[PDB]
Copies of this chain bind each other. A is one copy, B any other.
Amino acid sequence: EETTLLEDRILTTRNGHTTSTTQSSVGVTYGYATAEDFVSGPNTSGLETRVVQAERFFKTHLFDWVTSDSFGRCHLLELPTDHKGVYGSLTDSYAYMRNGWDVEVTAVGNQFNGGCLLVAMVPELCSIQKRELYQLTLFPHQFINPRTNMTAHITVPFVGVNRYDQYKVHKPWTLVVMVVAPLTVNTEGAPQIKVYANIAPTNVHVAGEFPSKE
């Protein structure tokens, strides 16, 4: 790690013409793989194309971490979610798509806060009982713990029973942020911490072009 009152664990991620820099890095977690599997299979008959213009960061607010949230308070975000940009327009121009996710979650208070957040990328999240939250570390994850860091970064591939997805009927991944230890503010911490996601789709491939409404 590196130096006096603040830090040099310093990472710049680039996705397209968008960059993000943290000085409290902790590294990135690669989930299930280091690369995607084959993008060109039998089910697309050679008709698929990469659309590099969608591989870039978009942003959404997740929740506000406050002192009354207890162990097991969660916020889920299913992926893909509403995107009003060029990724979002792909889902209405092509019948089949596949992409992984480069995920960056922020919880900035200051180093006088306490408590701890687990951020995780779960596939096919249909239900999670309370007792299973004790095993959420089974999934690609990283913690946000104020005394160390303010950013979590997980990079995950496309997964699914099928090589290309139809995102209007299926959501392969859910970002989950879970409170593992309640926020403490003491005399000097931030009164609450807003949690934000900066997400980039990676390796987006589309196949099967739709008509227009003309």
A residues sitting closer than 8 Å to B (CB atoms) are 1-8, 111, 147, 187-188
- A6 to B187 CA separation, bound complex (whole angstroms): 19
Chain B residue nearest in CB terms to A6 = B4
- A6 to B149 CA separation, bound complex (whole angstroms): 13
Nearest Cβ in chain B — how far from A62, in angstroms?
Answer: 26
Copies in the complex: 3
Residues of B with C-beta under 8 A to A4: 1-8
Among A3, A4, A5, A147, the most chain B Cβ lie within 10 Å of the Cβ of: A4
- A111 to B3 CA separation, bound complex (whole angstroms): 14
Q: A3's contact among B2, B187, B188, by CB below 8 Å, is which?
A: B2
Q: List 21 A–B pairs whose Cβ atoms lie within 8 Å, in order of A's numbering.
A: A1-B3, A1-B8, A2-B2, A2-B3, A2-B4, A3-B3, A3-B4, A3-B7, A3-B8, A4-B4, A4-B6, A4-B7, A4-B8, A5-B5, A5-B6, A5-B111, A5-B147, A6-B147, A187-B187, A187-B188, A188-B188
Chain B residue nearest in CB terms to A7 = B4
Chain B residue nearest in CB terms to A186 = B188
Nearest Cβ in chain B — how far from A25, in angstroms?
Answer: 12
- A8 to B3 CA separation, bound complex (whole angstroms): 9
Nearest Cβ in chain B — how far from A187, in angstroms?
Answer: 7
Residues of B with C-beta under 8 A to A3: 1-4, 7-8
Residues of B with C-beta under 8 A to A2: 2-4
Nearest Cβ in chain B — how far from A150, in angstroms?
Answer: 13
